[PDB]
C-alpha cells in the first residue's frame, strides 16, 4: 500500500483512528477507565475512535448483564463503520478491514486476535493493562 516503508506505517498521523474490539471495550468499562480520555492520555494525541456493527452486534448478543457496556459503546460522539458482510464475526471483520486499508490502530485484548494482527505488518495494537492503556507497535509514542 501507499505510504509504507518496510513495515513502518507512515500513514498514521494524529488524529489516530482507533478500532475497538468487544473484549477491549468490556474490559475497559470494567477497569473503570474513560475510553476516549484514557486513549488520548495513552497516545498523547487526538483520536477518533470507531466501533463496527460487528462489535456492536457481539455486545448486543451478550446478555443484559452487559447493559452498562452497551450504553458506553453507544456513546454518541463516536463514529460507526457499517460493515458489508454476512457472518458478523468481529475478528474477521476487523482483520479484513485492516488488511484492506491499514490506517487504524486495533485496540484488543485477546491473544488470538493479537497474534493474528501481529502477523500482518504495520498495525499498532492498544490493550488495557489494569492501570491505563498500553500501545504496542507505534513508532511515535
Amino acid at each position: 500500500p501507499s505510504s509504507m516503508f518496510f513495515e513502518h506505517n507512515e500513514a498514521l498521523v494524529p488524529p489516530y483512528n482507533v478500532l475497538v474490539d468487544t473484549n477491549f471495550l468490556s474490559r475497559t468499562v470494567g477497569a473503570k477507565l474513560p475510553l476516549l480520555e484514557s486513549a488520548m492520555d495513552c497516545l498523547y494525541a487526538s483520536v477518533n475512535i470507531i466501533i463496527t456493527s460487528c462489535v456492536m452486534a457481539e455486545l448486543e448478543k451478550l446478555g443484559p448483564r452487559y447493559r452498562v457496556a452497551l450504553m458506553i459503546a453507544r456513546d454518541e460522539r463516536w463514529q460507526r463503520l457499517t460493515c458489508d458482510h454476512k457472518g458478523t464475526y468481529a475478528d474477521d471483520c476487523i482483520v479484513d478491514r485492516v488488511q484492506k486499508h491499514r490506517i487504524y490502530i486495533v485496540a484488543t485484548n485477546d491473544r488470538d486476535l493479537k497474534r493474528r494482527i501481529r502477523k500482518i505488518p504495520g498495525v499498532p495494537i492498544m490493550s488495557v493493562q489494569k492501570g491505563k492503556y498500553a500501545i504496542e507497535r507505534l513508532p511515535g509514542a
Binding site: 501507499s2 505510504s3 507512515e10 500513514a11 498521523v13 483512528n17
Partner: protein, 242 residues
C-alpha cells in the same frame, strides 16, 4: 525512445477493446482509432497495413488517469465495446477521445465538461467523433442534462472537487443502471490537503459506501501520478452486469 518509424506488433490486451503494442525496446498502450489518419491532440498513432483504414492511437498514461490505471493493473474496467459511459470532468476530451474509441460506433460516450473553452475543444472532438456527445454544464447539477443522458452502464469521474463523492452520488442516483460500474480518480492533495493519502482514500471509499455503491477495487497508480488512487465500485449490487 519509441521513435517514429520503428516496427511494432499489436496484440490484444486482456480488457475488451484495448490493445498493447509491443516492439523493439518499448511496449506501450493503444486503442483502435475511430476516425483514421487524424490525430486529436498530437499523439503518436500506429498504422497497420492489413492484407489503410485501420490505425491505433498511443495512449499517454502520464496524461490520462484511465490509461495510468490500466497499466497499474486494474482487475476490470467495465467498459466493453458498446457500453454507454458517462464521463464526468471531460476537460478538452483527450481521455474522452480514447474512451469513445474504446466504446466504438455502437455505444456512446457522454462527455460532461464545465469550462467553456475546454468546451470548445470538446465540441471540436465531438464533431470529429460521432459516438461521443458533449454536454457543457456543471456536473453538480444533473437536472440540467437529465434530458440528454440515458441509463449508462459506466460512470467515469475525473473531477477533483471537495464535493466529489456527492457529485458522483447524485449523478449515479440519476443516471446509472442497476449494478452500474464506476471508476473514480481521487487526488488526495485536493480532497484533503492536510491529511495523509491512505487516510484520504479510506475516507472517500467510506463516503461512497454511504452513497450506496460497493467498492470492489482500489489501486494507487504510483509510478505515473503522485498521491492518486483509482477506485472501482459497483452501484447497488455485487457483480457487475446482472
Amino acid at each position: 525512445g519509441a521513435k517514429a518509424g520503428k516496427k511494432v506488433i499489436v496484440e490484444p490486451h486482456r480488457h475488451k477493446g484495448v490493445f498493447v503494442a509491443r516492439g523493439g525496446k518499448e511496449d506501450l498502450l493503444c486503442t483502435a482509432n475511430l476516425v483514421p489518419g487524424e490525430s486529436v491532440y498530437g499523439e503518436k498513432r500506429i498504422s497497420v497495413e492489413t492484407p489503410t483504414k485501420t490505425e491505433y492511437r498511443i495512449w499517454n498514461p502520464f496524461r490520462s488517469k484511465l490509461a495510468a490505471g490500466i497499466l497499474g493493473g486494474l482487475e476490470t474496467i467495465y467498459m466493453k465495446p458498446g457500453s454507454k459511459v458517462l464521463y464526468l470532468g471531460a476537460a478538452s476530451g483527450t481521455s474522452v477521445s480514447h474512451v469513445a474509441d474504446i466504446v466504438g460506433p455502437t455505444g456512446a460516450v457522454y462527455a460532461v465538461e464545465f469550462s467553456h473553452r475546454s468546451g470548445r475543444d470538446l465540441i471540436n472532438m465531438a464533431t470529429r467523433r460521432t459516438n461521443v456527445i458533449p454536454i457543457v454544464e456543471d456536473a453538480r447539477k444533473p437536472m440540467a442534462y437529465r434530458m440528454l443522458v440515458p441509463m449508462v452502464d459506466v460512470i467515469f469521474a475525473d473531477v477533483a472537487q471537495p464535493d466529489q463523492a456527492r457529485i458522483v452520488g447524485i449523478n449515479a442516483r440519476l443516471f446509472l443502471k442497476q449494478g452500474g460500474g464506476l471508476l473514480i480518480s481521487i487526488k488526495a492533495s485536493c480532497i484533503d490537503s492536510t491529511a495523509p493519502p491512505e487516510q484520504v482514500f479510506a475516507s472517500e471509499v467510506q463516503k461512497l459506501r454511504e452513497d450506496k455503491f460497493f467498492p470492489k477495487e482500489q489501486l494507487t497508480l504510483e509510478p505515473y501520478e503522485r498521491d492518486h488512487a483509482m477506485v472501482s465500485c459497483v452501484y447497488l449490487q455485487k457483480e457487475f452486469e446482472g
